[PDB]
């Protein structure tokens, strides 16, 4: 036992966990814990759930390395219950690994990450994929997983054994949790970033 190594997905945790952050409100002083989020790129854009930031007077984001920024709401999307925040990027931002070439397969191992107790991670697999409810996008709508999904990780990341982003944990039929495919999450972010610059 002493010589060998335990089976673990701590690799994926090292790679993707730094990029997952907390999201707070700071009304007035009251500092509430809203939920989780995911740093997407060096520009300082972050994805989170719309419900998390719905009634937010002041939004604050806290990284696992100790840094704390104030974020501004770039824009949200009710249908997918997503929202994009923006923060000033001091030199060095941890970003969520993304592989646009990777094709998620049913059965894949996935870790769910978010802060309820500090950062927390649960393990499951991709239970199913397809489209659900109103699907204006025309593209695959949901991603199901038996990894525990709750408020504590709602808005957080869902990643494979490699650490690559598979989806965004969301709340929008028991024992199963849902995430928004990273391909759809990417597209929605871009359209929210671009259409945020509009009269």
């Amino acid at each position: 036992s002493t010589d060998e190594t335990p089976a673990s997905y701590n690799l994926a945790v090292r790679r993707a966990a730094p990029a997952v952050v907390n999201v707070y409100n700071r009304g007035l002083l009251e500092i509430r814990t809203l939920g989780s989020g995911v740093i997407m790129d060096q520009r300082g854009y972050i994805i989170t759930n719309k419900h998390v930031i719905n009634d937010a007077d002041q939004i604050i984001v806290a990284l696992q390395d100790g840094r704390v920024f104030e974020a501004l709401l770039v824009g949200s999307d009710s249908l997918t219950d997503l929202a994009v925040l923006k923060i000033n990027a001091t030199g060095g931002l941890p970003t969520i690994p993304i592989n646009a070439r990777r094709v998620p397969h049913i059965g894949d191992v996935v870790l769910a990450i978010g802060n309820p107790l500090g950062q927390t991670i649960t393990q499951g697999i991709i239970s199913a994929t397809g489209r659900i409810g109103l699907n204006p996008t025309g593209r695959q709508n949901f991603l199901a997983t038996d990894a525990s999904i709750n408020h504590g990780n709602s808005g957080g990341a869902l990643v494979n054994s490699l650490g690559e982003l598979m989806g965004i944990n969301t709340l929008s039929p028991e024992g199963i949790g849902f995430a928004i495919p990273f391909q759809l999450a990417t597209k929605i972010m871009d359209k929210l970033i671009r259409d945020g610059r509009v009269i």
Copy 2:
């Protein structure tokens, strides 16, 4: 990340999932979703739970490849809450992989498969094995697992990382799901097939 491969049990899914089917009723027109089932052999025999087909006027079975047959009830077994259906086998039927030589061990990884949301798969391990309640068979009665078992997969298959059949998800003490060992399920099917041909 781009080069390597994610840890996954999609192999087992490819092999065993095609064989797991939906089971409906078609009263009158009302088409209800009853539960799941498992194609066992080329002859077109299918195992499912007795509760699934208890009050069924007309039974219908739908494969993942798009085909839809009408099934007839070969016979059921109250003690194990199993039931065997029969369908006309057009050329080419997907059947559930079975290894009569394989000995299930506690700790083994297992996937639970069934259609609640479309086909769905959850992951767990064999938590325990033994005999429970009235045991006329004299042989091992149950197989416990922490893979989520629910109505949506009740009657579906339980398989290992290889795809080999370990048991039949059933409903007949919290956080744990149950399946009927494939060795017992086989024997019960045969006796229901044979004793179905009786005056």
Copy 3:
């Protein structure tokens, strides 16, 4: 399929499971099932939860190999809800593998073991680690995991793929179970053993 081998953690089960035992009370005759415990060393010391043995007139311990001893309460610790029992060690006692050099990492695979249905094992990962509530020890207080933790395994062991002891399942915020790090459990046991010899 026939040639290959299923993915399994039965190795860890073989190594650590024999050491996990049942704990009963024997009032008067009534024999109640209290919970689970863990043989720690050849001297015959066993760890269990304090709630398990709180109102115990006579304590009995049953191994998976068939042997049955009477245990005496060495002492307990309210803060960590632990308790140490002592039994006469006939030649040959199964003890829980321990690696004082092993550093638990988040994401590690872990099996939870205890007797509710006979011995049962569930699989999860180390979700988180840190310190919680009143922390007089100054050292890391808790270990979180998404392996199912319940009364049936409360007091039982939590081990990695190797079988090495990671913690003691305990009851002292949903979907997540807790265990006491084995490094803290060791220290508490020793202090209870030593300070048990006191006027």
